[PDB]
Amino acid sequence: SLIDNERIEKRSRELYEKYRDAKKRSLFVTPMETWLEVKG
Amino acid sequence: LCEWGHRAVAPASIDRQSVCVKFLMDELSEEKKLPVVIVVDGWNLFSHETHFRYPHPDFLRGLASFNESSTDIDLYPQELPR
Amino acid sequence: RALADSLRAYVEFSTSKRVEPWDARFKPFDRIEKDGVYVLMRYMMEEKLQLCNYHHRPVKRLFCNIGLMGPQITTKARWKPYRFATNP
Amino acid sequence: VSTGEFDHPPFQFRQRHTFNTTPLHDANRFGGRTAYLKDPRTVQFNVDVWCAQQTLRKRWKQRDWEVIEIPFRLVPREQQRVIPELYTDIPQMTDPARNDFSNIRNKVYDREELQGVLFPAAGTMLYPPLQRVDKQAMTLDKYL
Amino acid sequence: NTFLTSSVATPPISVIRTGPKWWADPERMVRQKLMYFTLGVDQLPLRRTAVIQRDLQRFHMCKPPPRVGDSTGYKRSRAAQLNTWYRRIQYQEYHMQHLFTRHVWGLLRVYPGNTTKIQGKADDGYVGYDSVPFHRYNRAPLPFPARELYERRK
Amino acid sequence: YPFLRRPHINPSAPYFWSFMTAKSQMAFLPEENYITGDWTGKFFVSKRQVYTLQHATSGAKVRVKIFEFNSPSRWNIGKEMNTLT
Amino acid sequence: SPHGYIRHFENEVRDLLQYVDGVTPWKQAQKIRTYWEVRSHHPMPQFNRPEVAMHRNTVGLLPAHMWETDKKTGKVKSVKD
Amino acid sequence: GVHRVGYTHPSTLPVPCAQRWDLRLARARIFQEYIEEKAPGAWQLEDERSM
Amino acid sequence: EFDAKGREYVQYMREFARFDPRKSRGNGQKGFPFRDAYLTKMNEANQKTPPPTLETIMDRAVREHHQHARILSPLEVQRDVGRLEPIPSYAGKINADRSVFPFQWKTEDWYEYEVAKVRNRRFVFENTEEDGIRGSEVTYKIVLEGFWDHHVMKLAEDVCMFLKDVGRQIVEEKLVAVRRLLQGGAVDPELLAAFNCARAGPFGGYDEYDKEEVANFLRSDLRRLEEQCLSVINRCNVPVPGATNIYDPHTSWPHVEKLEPWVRMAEFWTSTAHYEFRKFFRVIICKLPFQSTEFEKRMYDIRHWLHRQTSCEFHTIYRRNVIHDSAVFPTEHDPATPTTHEHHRMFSFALDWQSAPVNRLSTDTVREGENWDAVAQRLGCSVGELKDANAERETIEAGVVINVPVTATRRLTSFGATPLVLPLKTTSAKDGERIRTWEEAAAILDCTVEELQQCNGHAALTYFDSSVTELVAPLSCWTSTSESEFSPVERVHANDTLVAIAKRLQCSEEALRAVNDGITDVSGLDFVRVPPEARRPRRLVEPQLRPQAATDALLARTIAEEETFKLKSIPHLPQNAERFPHEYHTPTSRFPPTPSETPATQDWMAYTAKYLDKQFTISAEPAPVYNVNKLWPMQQIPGKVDQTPFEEDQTWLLHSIPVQQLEMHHHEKDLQDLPFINHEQFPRSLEWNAP
């Protein structure tokens, strides 16, 4: 759980911004939308 | 904060609970004055593993047609690391 | 031509989307369509369930492979019987 | 001892779904895998195969260790002996001399103990040292 | 529940004639007592059945003596009276078992077997995925999928 | 009677290659499809002989215990005469 | 003389193989075809079993160039030579 | 857990030791043991009825 | 006294009390300890016996002290209200320990105990150098079979009264000779040489025994033989008609032991009837501390006066000396190119491997200008031993034949792996043109016309046509030379050192240093050239493996016609086979099919690094340096993708495993037709043991 603790914290704080921005367009936000990579 | 996290309409609660719990854990870790007692039944479960497995990478990569990639996701079950 | 009829019928039905195999009566498929297992199906399985055309064997094996449901997805989830899923 | 059913029910007549009886070959007996089903002998053989599958899966889930093959020199004194192969000699006790009466074959070594022989190339402790509690210390348990 | 097939009714007398085999099977009686205890109600008919069956099983191997014969017949009449009293207590407990099990199934949202009545949910027979395509008694077409007696939320 | 030990041994589409047919498809054709040794000719061909393209061709004669099989077509190839009856 | 299993007949298997090789000509051996080789002439020799991959069946696997189907029910009424 | 079975040559290890696959091949040479290549690693069933 | 079970368990407990795993060696099921006590000892939870409960201690103390009335044991209280018995000595004196009683054990340990006990039934070394009954050298067992238990019992009594007297006289006449030899004798020079045969003895190097020491060894052996003979004679004299017991090994000699009767019940129509054949057995065991062919003769001659309708069979377990000739069966370094699983394939036992032992050339030819020590160094033998082996010739001349000493460590196998070719079109022949005749080429190769035919095949069937240039000589012709036979280079182990390589190759450190350009360290090297003086070199390939030439000769016509017709290939499976897995189910394939290998799935760290967390630091869960066996205890072919047995029920349920539908087949239960038929060869007891 603590491997890359600082880097993961930085990434999560950066990603919360993207999540909040996305919540203004879709009722349900998705990990595939935020960080998980689901392509065609 | 807890009320905002857990009081919501589905599926909007699914993505809200993660944010709520992450921030609640961060703030509880920050607090350094109030004694907080954490009691958990069955700590071995939180210690070793959960029976959930990682999804097969085919469900994430994406597919066009099934006979193309010769994927066996719907042909044979597998056991991803827990 | 009699053999032709049977073979064509089999091949045509193979492509059919007869029914969703899972029994909505019993959990975990009991939950409302907007939460629980249906969210995972809608956002990770739509591209695969439609490919397999909702056949019970592909559906069960895909559910097993995804793993986020776990062994319970067949240890406690009740599907429809053979013919009861076969009929559209 | 196991309380699960091992034999297939006999067929001497057609049963019904009643208070004390259920239809033969229903989706309740062996986890619904009777949908594949004639001859009692072959049916019992298939049930035996299924029971062996269950035994194997639980026996393997019970397994939490791994069988890395270590060279003789880099090995504990208890395993620096000659260990007969399975079913060749009497179940061997680890060390009767040191009052360790335990099947040596079932011994399991914590992975955070052989880092000196495993991973000799990595100069950093990939697994932190194991924390061992002090028995000779007044603690909440020993206070009453 | 996972016994969802069409079933066959059985008269309470033939249900109770089993006794130690299934009717008074000790494990089954223990879990019925556990159902009642969890619901929070006294298991009095169950305990009457339990003591009846214990005392009957204590003697089931003894052959009664050949009766000499009394014209008044008061002895035979009293014996039959007590036998029927025991049978009636067992009938009461038999009915209680079904009543409370159906109530609990309705509470927990458990679908019963075909042609089973749950007081709140399905007054008439509930039939789901039966061999016969229509109602066994009402001669009407059952819908696909089987009727959902309860809500969807878990 | 012992199981499946009798002296005497409606086509299915999905199991067309798996009913009364050899377990393995890689296996070569049986003794009944080939001329073993010096012969004068067969009165009948064995009912286990696999229909072939040569059979679907001119096919001088076809006799199976009596059946004529004088309706040659490519749909009859790949299966034994017992289930081609 | 070895007895019992075939794995104990070390020399005799070698002798049988050498003899059969020296006696069998490839001109005689070219004739035996395989079951799948015979099947290949069928309009549609390969089917997907209902055990594993029945769902893989695609409309292209059918021999649709040699028969005609009715427009109402869809089943084949006749077949061509 | 689908995986690929591994092998370490005695030379690569810091202190060499006769590997168990090498011992297996030695046993196969001595006793002429046919080793089926396609033997599945998942199908290891023992007849409990006898064992 | 005691009942049967009480006696049985008292004997069990005494055996366990005097049990010793070291004394339980070389023995069958009789070496296994008292199962219950042994497993209770092994169980760890039973290694801690809880002390009495606080309530028990409080009550005992209250009655002992506050009330002046000690608590008596249930065995110490007087139950008979009209009689007063004496308290037993064991009343309250037996301590309670969980490791001794009651017996609790682990299920897996019990399973192993049972399986090992049933599998080590015949792993008994009957003839040992023990004392009394256990000690013997030759064990004879006579299994007497009859149709009635009393018939066989009476026959056993007769045969015992026979063998008792015969063995008495024979052991008597052996005892006379033993006593005479003890009184005095002479040492055999053959025996003294046998003692002073070893090169280096236990004490330092060469040892030198004396005839006096040899006679002392003989005296010890003959004394123990005398003790064994006297025990046999005394046991022979014990039995008397007034009080005789021939079923006890301690009382009489020989003793009779019982064997389970062979019973075969058959049920058939009549309305059904059950009738069973029966055959009763008795085993007479004679254990002699010497091999007497006279006794063997008199024992074999019993079948001629055997009782009516009774038969007998003889089992003999005798000590025999077996030599392990290290010369014909030597120890060699594991070859440079190791064997793979292909060499142990189906039908490989006939095509790939020579029968052991592999021939090693005892004869050599001398090369050009080879020095006497040069030949010895090339053969890996010492100069002195080479002289001793080839004392016929004082000096070595080129091209002469020499006898390589058996202990030479560079001895050569039959034929080298490098083929011998002989190009035609050469003008060296008589015609000065292409050699066309077959026998002229055969004479050039010094082989037979047929040997030359088989090794080519193509020239024979095209028989010459100018298309033939390369002519391979027959395997029986070309030779193996040490340079090709032995690997010129050897791989260096990790963290190896030059002294270690020198010791491994039995060469000289300076030899390695000179051959390898004077290198000091080897850490920057993976392969080092071996000196030609290495006394323990590593062969290029396994000596026991067949040459490809032998199998080509086996398949001579196949290759000839293949090269003639130029047939390339024909696919075994059609090009669309892969798309349909369940079809084309080849007979060698078997469920469960292995899915494809996902690139990064071996652990959660790899999965997170590749698919979930792209910026994950640790690529994968740390993997040790030594070899980890996932499919333990199953050894899979290395480098093969495989799947470990599943841990969920749904995987096994949903995975494609067919069910048995036709009749069951077993590779040995087919001769026994069915469980109800079960053909048997002879009516031997199911308890019968092969010696």
Coordinates of N, CA, C and O in Angstrom, one line a residue, chain B residues 1-6 15-26:
Chain B
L1 N -19.0 15.7 5.5 CA -18.2 15.0 4.5 C -18.7 13.6 4.3 O -19.0 13.1 3.2
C2 N -18.9 12.8 5.4 CA -19.4 11.5 5.3 C -20.8 11.5 4.7 O -21.2 10.6 3.9
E3 N -21.7 12.4 5.2 CA -23.0 12.5 4.6 C -23.0 12.8 3.1 O -23.8 12.2 2.4
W4 N -22.1 13.7 2.6 CA -22.0 14.0 1.2 C -21.6 12.7 0.5 O -22.0 12.4 -0.6
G5 N -20.7 11.9 1.1 CA -20.2 10.7 0.5 C -21.2 9.6 0.3 O -21.3 9.0 -0.7
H6 N -22.0 9.4 1.4 CA -22.9 8.2 1.4 C -24.3 8.5 1.0 O -25.1 7.6 0.7
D15 N -18.9 6.7 -7.5 CA -17.7 7.5 -7.7 C -17.6 8.5 -6.6 O -16.4 9.0 -6.3
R16 N -18.6 8.9 -5.9 CA -18.5 9.8 -4.8 C -17.9 9.2 -3.5 O -17.2 9.8 -2.8
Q17 N -18.3 7.9 -3.3 CA -17.8 7.2 -2.1 C -16.3 7.1 -2.1 O -15.6 7.2 -1.0
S18 N -15.7 6.9 -3.2 CA -14.2 6.7 -3.3 C -13.5 8.0 -2.9 O -12.6 8.0 -2.1
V19 N -14.0 9.2 -3.4 CA -13.5 10.5 -3.0 C -13.7 10.7 -1.5 O -12.8 11.1 -0.8
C20 N -14.9 10.4 -1.0 CA -15.2 10.6 0.4 C -14.3 9.8 1.3 O -13.7 10.3 2.2
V21 N -14.1 8.5 0.9 CA -13.3 7.7 1.8 C -11.8 8.1 1.7 O -11.1 8.1 2.7
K22 N -11.3 8.4 0.5 CA -9.9 8.8 0.4 C -9.6 10.1 1.3 O -8.7 10.1 2.0
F23 N -10.5 11.1 1.2 CA -10.3 12.3 1.9 C -10.5 12.1 3.4 O -9.8 12.7 4.2
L24 N -11.5 11.2 3.8 CA -11.7 10.9 5.2 C -10.4 10.2 5.8 O -10.0 10.6 6.9
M25 N -9.8 9.3 5.1 CA -8.6 8.6 5.5 C -7.5 9.6 5.6 O -6.7 9.6 6.6
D26 N -7.3 10.5 4.6 CA -6.3 11.5 4.7 C -6.4 12.4 5.9 O -5.4 12.6 6.6

